[PDB]
Amino acid sequence: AGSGQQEIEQTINKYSNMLTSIVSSLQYLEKINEVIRRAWAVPTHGHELGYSLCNSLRQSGGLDLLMKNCVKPDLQFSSAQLLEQCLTTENRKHVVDNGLDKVVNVACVCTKNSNMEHSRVGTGILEHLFKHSEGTCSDVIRLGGLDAVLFECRTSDLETLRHCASALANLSLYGGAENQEEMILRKVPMWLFPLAFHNDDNIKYYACLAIAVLVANKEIEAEVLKSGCLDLVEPFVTSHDPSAFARSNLAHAHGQSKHWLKRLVPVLSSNREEARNLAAFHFCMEAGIKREQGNTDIFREINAIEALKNVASCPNAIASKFAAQALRLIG
Asked: If 0-12 CB within 10 Å is exposed, 13-18 middle and 19+ buried, where does residue 63 land?
């Protein structure tokens, strides 16, 4: 077993070669899910360890293996549970182009059954599949992915809601004009209201963030305001430490992807102050996460510096201090 937190990389190749040896037996052990699960959960290097294991899973042909055998009944959940953990930026592109129907369908049926663990695996797959493209988000909405995350919004489990809240925030960004319109028809703010008021700071944060991205589209601004969840943003940002809430969320992983933050930049120049208060609250949260690893040039690659400067000068003191500390943590 692996334990501690040292510079030894000899642990990675042992479990990467073991991962490639089990995959090399294709023509059910399924202990690959139990090891990547704990490989992710490493305190400080889990993001470095998990990405290497999932890369060895894609480089050895195991990614194409989980997609073909997910139609077999006795191998459905084990393949989907291992696929839910290894949906990195590299593996996710290969999943969409060849067998997106096989993966979305097994994610929908995992949420329809009364087992909570199957419900968490399903929404965990739909959460990641909403972080690709507009065409991908439109296809998942067509195949029924949007119905499954909204159907799981009535749950009581926390881990399932955390997947359902994070799925709707990713769809709000990667969706676009036509897909955000579809979310208004599916009454997404109707089911984001119970998530926006959750006592869990994780569920409340990403629920409001999804709603904040939805008022950025000037065609649906009135419908998103009808829910009344934007009036909850200000008491949150004025009572939550950005450094501490960066350690409870997106500390394990090295923040959000650059393509994810690029989609959030236009929220900084929105009509509503509550949207700017939360968008700047996220970039001030991402600045320290990026500064720890030394990749602050990400914000210059996504034209986020131009927006943060216009916000650091606006009379709104809430978004002023958040956009200021972010820029000081970048350069």
From this structure: buried
Domain count of the fold of the chain: 3
Quote the domain boundaries for residue 8: 1-60
- Report CA dihedral (286, 287, 291, 295) to the nearest 10 degrees: 70
Q: Which residue has the tokens 């949207």?
A: 275
**Angle, helix 116-129 to helix 89-111, in steps of 10 degrees:** 140
Comparing CA positions, the residue from 201, 144, 206 lying closest to residue 172 is 206
Question: Token pair of 256, please?
Answer: 């959000």
Q: d(Cα 208, Cα 182) in Å, to the nearest integer? A: 18
What kind of experiment solved this structure? X-ray
**Contact (Cβ atoms closer than 8 angstroms) between residue 198 and residue 207:** yes
d(CA 106, CA 66): 11
Q: Which of 178, 209, 228 is the last residue of a domain?
A: 228
Same domain, 130 and 197: yes
DSSP 266: G
- In the numeric block, the tokens 């994780």 are attached to 202
Q: How buried is residue 122: exposed, middle or buried, by Cβ count under 10 Å (0-12/13-18/19+)? A: buried
Are 318 and 268 spatial neighbours (Cβ–Cβ below 8 Å)? Answer: no
Q: Are 150 and 78 in the same domain?
A: yes
Residues 136/100, Cβ–Cβ less than 8 Å: yes
Q: How far is CA 96 from CA 25, 106, 133, in A?
A: 25, 14, 10
Resolution rounded to one decimal, in angstroms: 3.3
List helix spans (H) across 134-187: 134-143, 145-151, 158-174, 177-185
